From a paper:
The polypyrimidine tract binding protein (PTB) is a well-characterized regulator of alternative splicing although it also has significant roles that affect the processing, localization and use of a variety of mRNAs. PTB (and its homologues) contain 4 RNA recognition motif domains (RRMs) separated by long flexible linkers and arrayed, when not bound to RNA, in a relatively extended, linear conformation.
Instead, phases were obtained by multi-wavelength anomalous dispersion (MAD) using data collected from a crystal of Se-Met-labeled nPTB34. The structures of the eight copies of nPTB34 within the asymmetric unit of our crystals are very similar to one another.
Residue numbers in the entry: 337 to 419, 424 to 531
The structure:
C-alpha cells in the first residue's frame, strides 16, 4: 500500500514536480505518474505505507491549483517507469527528500495544511520585506510574519490554507542567496 491515486487535479497546471513537492511534505515521494488517458489524475508512490496513509489523510480534500483534490489508495502495487511528455518522473534518492534521516518524522513539522507556514534556512540580510514580497508574488496576500530569534527561521501567514499550499509548492527549496535554499513547511503555531 505505497501507491496513492490523486484525482480531480488541475490538468493544465499540475506537474510531477508540484506533486513531488506537495506530497513530499508527508513522506518521500519515489515516483510520480500523471495518467495519459486522464490527465486530471496521477499516481504517487511513497517510500512506505505509513507515509501513504499520512499523505492521504492530510491532503484529501485540499485545494491545489484551484481544485479540490481526491486522494485514495491505488490498486497499483508500484508505479512503472516507461521504456516522453514528461508525465512520469523518477525521484529515487532525491536530495530533496525530507525524511532521509532516522527519526525525521518528528522534526519536519508534520502538520495538516495550515495558512501559517514555517520557514527555515534563511540567510542573513534577507529582510522581512524580501520574504513578504516573495510570498505575496505567489499570488497570495501575506497577513502576518515573525522572525525567530536568529532569523534563520520565520513564521509567515498567508490569507488562507489554499494560498499557503500554493506558496509552499512554489517556494520550498527557493534559492535565497549565499548558498541557502529555503525550506517551507506547515505549522500548528500562530503568530
Ligand atoms: Cl490508476
Ligand atoms: Zn491504473
Ligand atoms: Zn545559514
Amino acid at each position: 500500500n505505497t501507491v496513492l491515486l490523486v484525482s480531480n487535479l488541475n490538468e493544465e497546471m499540475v506537474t510531477p514536480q508540484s506533486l513531488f513537492t506537495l506530497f513530499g511534505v508527508y513522506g518521500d515521494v519515489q515516483r510520480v505518474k500523471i495518467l495519459y488517458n486522464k490527465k486530471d489524475s496521477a499516481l504517487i508512490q511513497m517510500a512506505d505505507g505509513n507515509q501513504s496513509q499520512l499523505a492521504m489523510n492530510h491532503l484529501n480534500g485540499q485545494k491545489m491549483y484551484g481544485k479540490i483534490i481526491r486522494v485514495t489508495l491505488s490498486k497499483h502495487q508500484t508505479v512503472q517507469l516507461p521504456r516522453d511528455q514528461g508525465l512520469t518522473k523518477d525521484f529515487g534518492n532525491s536530495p530533496l527528500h525530507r525524511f532521509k534521516k532516522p527519526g525525521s518524522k518528528n522534526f519536519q513539522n508534520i502538520f495538516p495544511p495550515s495558512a501559517t507556514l514555517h520557514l527555515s534556512n534563511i540567510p542573513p540580510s534577507v529582510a522581512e520585506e524580501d520574504l513578504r514580497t516573495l510570498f505575496a508574488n505567489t499570488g497570495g496576500t501575506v497577513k502576518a510574519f515573525k522572525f525567530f530569534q536568529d532569523h534563520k527561521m520565520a513564521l509567515l501567514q498567508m490569507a488562507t490554507v489554499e494560498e499557503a499550499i500554493q506558496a509552499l509548492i512554489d517556494l520550498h527549496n527557493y534559492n535565497l542567496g549565499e548558498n541557502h535554499h529555503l525550506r517551507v513547511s506547515f505549522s500548528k503555531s500562530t503568530i
